[PDB]
A paper describes a structure:
The folding and insertion of β-barrel proteins into the mitochondrial outer membrane is facilitated by the sorting and assembly machinery (SAM) complex. The SAM complex is composed of three subunits: β-barrel Sam50 embedded in the OMM, and two cytosolically associated subunits Sam35 and Sam37. The seam where the first and last β-strands of the Sam50 or BamA β-barrel meet is called the lateral gate. Unlike other β-barrel proteins in which the seam stays statically closed, the lateral gate of Sam50 and BamA is flexible and required to open for function.
To better understand how darobactin A binds and inhibits SAM complex function in vitro from a structural standpoint, we used single particle cryo-EM to solve the structure of the T. thermophilus SAM complex bound to darobactin A. The SAM complex was purified as a monomer in LMNG/GDN, mixed with darobactin A in a 1:2 SAM:darobactin A molar ratio and incubated at 4 °C for approximately 41 hours before freezing cryo-EM grids. One major population of the Sam50 lateral gate bound to darobactin A was separated using 3D classification. This final SAMdaro cryo-EM map was reconstructed from 163,391 particles to a resolution of 3.00 Å. In our initial cryo-EM map, Sam50 β1-4 are rotated outward by approximately 45° to form an open lateral gate. PyMOL analysis identified six hydrogen bonds stabilizing the interaction between darobactin A and Sam50 β1. All six hydrogen bonds are between backbone residues on both molecules, which suggests that the exact amino acid sequence is not as critical as the overall secondary structure. Therefore, it is likely that the backbone cyclizations of darobactin A are restricting the secondary structure into a conformation that is favorable for stably interacting with the SAM complex. In contrast, the Sam50 β-barrel is most similar between the SAMdaro and SAMop structures, superimposing with C-alpha RMSD of 1.54 Å, while the C-alpha RMSD of the SAMdaro and SAMcl structures is 2.79 Å. On the scale of fully open SAMstall and fully closed SAMcl, SAMdaro lateral gate opening is most similar to SAMop. In contrast, in our structure of the SAM complex bound to darobactin A, the Sam50 lateral gate is wide open with no interactions with β16 whatsoever. Our cryo-EM structure of the SAM complex bound to darobactin A suggests that this inhibition of SAM complex function is due to darobactin A stably associating with Sam50 β1 in the open conformation.
Numbering used by the authors:
A (entry chain A): 16 to 132, 140 to 333
B (entry chain B): 36 to 512
C (entry chain D): 1 to 7
D (entry chain C): -33 to -23, -10 to 76, 104 to 181, 233 to 386, 401 to 424
The structure:
Amino acid sequence: IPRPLQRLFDYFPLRIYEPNELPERSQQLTSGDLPTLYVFSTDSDARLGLPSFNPGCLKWQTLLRLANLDFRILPSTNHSSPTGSLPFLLPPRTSPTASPAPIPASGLLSFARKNPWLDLGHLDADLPPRAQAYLALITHSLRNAWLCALYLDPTHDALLRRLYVDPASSSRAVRAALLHQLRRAAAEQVATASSGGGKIVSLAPVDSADGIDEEAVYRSARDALDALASLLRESETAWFFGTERPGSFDAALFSYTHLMVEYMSEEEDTESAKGRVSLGRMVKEAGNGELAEHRERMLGVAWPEWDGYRR
Amino acid sequence: LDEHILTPASISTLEVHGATNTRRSLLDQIFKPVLEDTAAAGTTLGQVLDRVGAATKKLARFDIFKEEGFGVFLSEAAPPQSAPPTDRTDLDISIRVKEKSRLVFSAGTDFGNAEGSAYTNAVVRNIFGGAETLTVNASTGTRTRSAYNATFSTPINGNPDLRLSVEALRSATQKPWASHEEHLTGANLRLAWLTEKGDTHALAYSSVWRQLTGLAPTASPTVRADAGDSLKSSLTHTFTRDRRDNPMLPQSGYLFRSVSELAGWGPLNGDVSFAKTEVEASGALPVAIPGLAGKSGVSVGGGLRLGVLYPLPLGYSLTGAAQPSRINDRFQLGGPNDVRGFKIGGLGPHDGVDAVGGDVFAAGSVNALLPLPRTGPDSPLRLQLYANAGRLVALNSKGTDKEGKEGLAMDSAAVFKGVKSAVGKLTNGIPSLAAGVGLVYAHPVARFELNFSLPLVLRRGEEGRKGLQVGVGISFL
Amino acid sequence: WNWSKSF
Amino acid sequence: SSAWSHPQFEKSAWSHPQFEKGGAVQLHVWGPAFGLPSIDAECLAAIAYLAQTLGSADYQLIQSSPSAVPTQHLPTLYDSRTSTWIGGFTSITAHLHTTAASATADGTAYTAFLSAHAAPLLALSLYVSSANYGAATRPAYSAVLPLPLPWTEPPAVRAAMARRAAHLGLSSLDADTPEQKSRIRLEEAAREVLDVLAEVDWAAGGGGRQVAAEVRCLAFGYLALMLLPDVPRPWLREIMEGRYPALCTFVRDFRARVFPQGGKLLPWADGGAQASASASASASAVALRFVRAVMAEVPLVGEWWSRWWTARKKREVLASKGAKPAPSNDGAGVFFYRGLPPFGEAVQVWRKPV
Ligand SMILES: CC(C)[C@@H](C)/C=C/[C@@H](C)[C@H]1CC[C@H]2C3=CC=C4C[C@@H](O)CC[C@]4(C)[C@H]3CC[C@]12C
Ligand SMILES: CC(C)[C@@H](C)/C=C/[C@@H](C)[C@H]1CC[C@H]2C3=CC=C4C[C@@H](O)CC[C@]4(C)[C@H]3CC[C@]12C
Ligand SMILES: CC(C)[C@@H](C)/C=C/[C@@H](C)[C@H]1CC[C@H]2C3=CC=C4C[C@@H](O)CC[C@]4(C)[C@H]3CC[C@]12C
Ligand SMILES: CC(C)[C@@H](C)/C=C/[C@@H](C)[C@H]1CC[C@H]2C3=CC=C4C[C@@H](O)CC[C@]4(C)[C@H]3CC[C@]12C
Ligand SMILES: CC(C)[C@@H](C)/C=C/[C@@H](C)[C@H]1CC[C@H]2C3=CC=C4C[C@@H](O)CC[C@]4(C)[C@H]3CC[C@]12C
Ligand SMILES: CC(C)[C@@H](C)/C=C/[C@@H](C)[C@H]1CC[C@H]2C3=CC=C4C[C@@H](O)CC[C@]4(C)[C@H]3CC[C@]12C
Ligand SMILES: CC(C)[C@@H](C)/C=C/[C@@H](C)[C@H]1CC[C@H]2C3=CC=C4C[C@@H](O)CC[C@]4(C)[C@H]3CC[C@]12C
Ligand SMILES: CC(C)[C@@H](C)/C=C/[C@@H](C)[C@H]1CC[C@H]2C3=CC=C4C[C@@H](O)CC[C@]4(C)[C@H]3CC[C@]12C
Ligand SMILES: CC(C)[C@@H](C)/C=C/[C@@H](C)[C@H]1CC[C@H]2C3=CC=C4C[C@@H](O)CC[C@]4(C)[C@H]3CC[C@]12C
Ligand SMILES: CC(C)[C@@H](C)/C=C/[C@@H](C)[C@H]1CC[C@H]2C3=CC=C4C[C@@H](O)CC[C@]4(C)[C@H]3CC[C@]12C
Ligand SMILES: CC(C)[C@@H](C)/C=C\[C@@H](C)[C@H]1CC[C@H]2C3=CC=C4C[C@@H](O)CC[C@]4(C)[C@H]3CC[C@]12C
Ligand SMILES: CC(C)[C@@H](C)/C=C\[C@@H](C)[C@H]1CC[C@H]2C3=CC=C4C[C@@H](O)CC[C@]4(C)[C@H]3CC[C@]12C
């Protein structure tokens, strides 16, 4: 029955017009000639392409700048990510109503190799077995310190509110709800850590700062930075393992050392009222100061035009 | 029996039986107008039976009493009267009513839809003796979050036609046409009012936290850019003049609806600010034929729906920078209900495969209902021939000269110029047009249609459906 | 199943 | 809400008091299993650390469960010399602590690596795989707890370990062509971790990489629970025995040297592993532990119960540590639908006024 009538269905529609134009909001945001990387940043930061304030997003933003990819960054949120978590890259529209598929975080480096503006093997080289052990310091020891000090410290409540929840909405009721979810999720991840966590109350995971041991997280970070400073001192060059160019390991460490110095180098936590050295102070005091100048050198390579990055 | 209604009459007393929970003061409001209009003139049963005939569904609109409990025992008054105008001038009337169940609790599960789908319902009615109601709904399952609901409804000052409702809401809505889902959380305050002429008014205040999550892998850049949180605090007015003889399958009469919504402007506060209005005019017209007197069953209908979404600045100033609209608020058009013959949301701008909304739209319909041969026109199932047109456009700042590229907001003159251009786009070019033939069923819980549609004029990127299409619902164009 | 305890 | 912030102190990284050799300390660990002093990887490492750095009479081992200690975490050390509670292996070693810089950095690196990645691998073998749980480890957990507890604690342990190994992406059916791809992912994930560990000279016989004895004890804790436990799915034991003979030799020599004869020679409290738990196996104490464990599963109240209970325990540990934690904050229902009469009578009547 469909076969004889196919000579009739193919006739319609009788008139086909040009597509309707996209809304104004879509035209302003999604139209661009350069691939756009969506990260956690502010509208003023995104204008100059300055480093994002999220260490997970800053890791990939640094590598893409080392990969010599020409791109622009835009503020975004995890809800828009194809993998449910930032960052991700949208290549520019081929036509005003069509766009290629988004590039997740894992496929960013493959995208950069296809769009030279060259051998990018150093940015995704397989680390030596010893280097795998040290990478656990960055991904676990330093990450847990970042999460505990940012989300769970009342001292950084103003900063956390300004960075993450204030741009989300202007409603105080919605802001309070979003802030609680952020702290619940952050406390859950730190609770999984062996040092500052490992406590089990019931089947549900621990999701409060009460299940987190602040000293165990803080002490592990202080030990991690001293260890990383020792590893960097071993190399005869300015980068880890003697490489002549920064690699995936350097970008991974830089994503934490930069933000710790930027946002937590204040003299209020280091004051006797708290009795603990701030994260940004430990970064500059680690070893003889290798991690401080490594952060300076990494900025001089990926952001040569930028200045005023101390705090 | 009709000669009993032509005689003079004068009612003496009335009694209501079984209203133990409802306060008598509430009962007074319906019966005092009955009580005041008594012994007015002869043949008053012509007046009396209709005015109590008004009362029966007046009490039914309270929803307190079971629909079956309306036993009327009107009779001639037993005691005599001094020189009465007629032997049956005096009457005795008593009404029997049984109240509905005070509390209703419901729960269950349905593994056919989801592996852990379960729902819980509880209804409490006629609290405090004044027809206050309270309904609580809770739903869970798998691959979904918990959904709650709690509505408290009450008549105002004993008037059944003026009902105030307070609702607390938490739900998630799937939106496959835009490759995302919307999480809702907020409260609504409604004041529904029914005019003496039958017109329905409704003034509602809403404050809902919208959140676009769960983007499908095919989500377009437009959907991704609009993901995230948004608080909409809006005040909306709904008007409805329904004169259709059968609202579920109109053969005669007309319908008019207006839905005006103001969000974010002035005292309202939130992440959005606009003034959205919709107008839906419909009508039908029976046509007679020489071959059969009386009700022929054939009729010709029509329809016309309009809508404008105007961005507004926040604060108390009419002149100022206005943010462009978001995918949550933009109109959606197309489908078996809105514009027959297209994919659900198949009209308007499309980003890849996602149907992103528009700011200005205008849909229309022309249809004719016919009865099948060897079947009476009183049958609820009929043949339908229809032709649907629609347009859905989006506001653009192409007409502006220059604006700061950092800012996303548009000045007041820019928005006005954009709206004028958007409305002008409706009147040029043939609208997206579809036509077809189908069968319509008017079974009074929902209208059922089995349509064979065939798109005629279409904009590139719009999705038509050339095959059979089934649409079930209470609202049709 | 779908229970209903109305009273 | 004050439940998601660093605790306030009466007027955050308060250091623990320095330990001095001589004071009696008590280590609360899980019970013996699989012929090992303990069943948990961290607890077994802590036992080995004490057996090498402290004399046989300077410490005691107490078989316990997380509900029996204020830290809600095992292993935990009770330094009776100052009555402080220290939870976690790293915190215990730091408390008891008295190219070196390259060696010190390596010890820190592998300590984080073992916790970060060797732990999920261990959880996958013993907890995520339902075949090994129902036949090898769940009997072991129940054998070291008082009667009503094995229905509350071991289920809670599995949930933690399942979350711990969740980042691997594998689940229970992979413990077993769909079978072949599951098997190769088992060997791939194990090789991704065991390759790093094979870099270090754990036996400390010379060459390789030299690390402090603190992390060598930790290495044994994770490796011993991966090799020795006889489970119905010995795939992880098979990989280590064949591909990595050096790790197999290290575990066997370490066990024979540090835990000769099943490890029963350790100074368990009250002269035995089971007798040690008797101090907290009283009927009243066990009942409270079970009841508190039950309350946490209430769908709405239970979640807030554990958050309040954990905060209370957090203050107790901090108070013992010499800190000064700030104090924390803590009919009409019968008058309706009952008691009051119905608002009207069954009969209401009106008549024409005079
Ligand atoms: C019966 C009347 C009142 C109305 C409602 C019906 C209109 C339909 C059935 C018919 C009437 C005129 C037709 C019409 C006129 C001219 C053209 C131009 C041609 O290139 C494409 C088809 C198109 C656009 C067709 C489409 C179908 C139309 C619009
Ligand atoms: C558009 C929304 C946002 C809000 C601001 C608008 C409210 C107006 C338009 C509504 C609110 C109350 C309404 C109202 C109240 C009562 C009556 C009496 C009736 O016999 C005629 C209509 C009339 C006069 C209607 C007309 C429409 C009114 C005035
Ligand atoms: C097809 C749609 C648009 C339906 C709703 C049509 C509506 C219009 C044509 C109807 C709706 C109300 C009607 C209407 C209301 C009241 C009166 C007053 C009377 O003294 C003259 C006719 C007049 C003026 C009629 C004319 C026809 C009107 C305006
Ligand atoms: C004149 C009055 C007093 C009485 C006799 C009848 C009025 C009706 C029949 C008239 C009054 C206004 C008329 C009317 C107004 C406007 C339009 C819009 C047009 O697009 C379709 C016809 C339509 C809908 C017509 C139909 C016929 C109507 C509704
Ligand atoms: C209810 C009676 C008393 C009167 C007032 C109502 C008249 C309305 C409802 C009727 C009268 C004339 C009708 C009318 C005339 C002509 C057409 C053109 C047709 O293509 C679409 C329907 C349409 C537009 C219908 C709609 C319904 C109308 C407007
Ligand atoms: C050479 C000129 C005179 C030709 C091209 C113009 C014809 C005009 C009269 C036609 C062309 C397109 C038509 C048109 C397009 C779309 C719609 C939307 C529909 O909901 C109402 C009618 C409306 C607004 C009609 C009205 C009549 C228009 C404007
Ligand atoms: C929420 C549920 C699980 C609660 C109320 C039920 C508890 C009962 C069924 C459980 C709790 C503790 C259990 C209990 C504790 C200890 C012993 C000693 C043993 O030699 C015989 C069985 C016996 C006596 C069991 C029997 C079952 C008991 C009494
Ligand atoms: C019959 C006696 C001699 C002994 C052997 C029997 C003990 C059983 C029946 C008792 C002991 C502990 C009890 C028990 C412990 C804890 C819970 C968790 C709760 O969320 C569901 C019930 C459940 C699972 C109950 C069920 C009944 C159990 C399993
Ligand atoms: C007479 C003796 C042999 C009885 C009392 C035994 C007591 C001991 C074994 C303790 C151990 C665990 C306790 C126990 C566990 C849990 C609960 C659930 C609670 O909701 C009621 C009490 C109940 C059931 C208590 C009762 C006393 C028990 C069963
Ligand atoms: C003496 C007893 C009968 C009294 C204290 C009852 C307590 C209730 C509130 C407790 C007892 C057992 C508990 C219970 C047992 C097992 C489970 C399965 C789990 O997946 C969801 C929670 C659930 C369903 C919890 C909910 C709370 C219950 C039902
Ligand atoms: C004779 C020429 C000039 C015609 C056929 C060409 C174009 C225009 C004017 C025609 C083509 C399709 C027509 C058309 C299609 C369908 C409808 C829907 C109906 O509810 C209102 C009229 C409306 C909107 C008419 C109006 C006139 C249109 C738009
Ligand atoms: C510079 C000025 C003179 C330019 C921009 C023109 C108009 C200004 C004043 C704007 C400010 C508020 C606007 C305004 C408010 C609300 C609505 C309701 C909507 O349903 C139709 C448009 C309408 C009526 C628009 C029209 C344009 C207005 C009146």
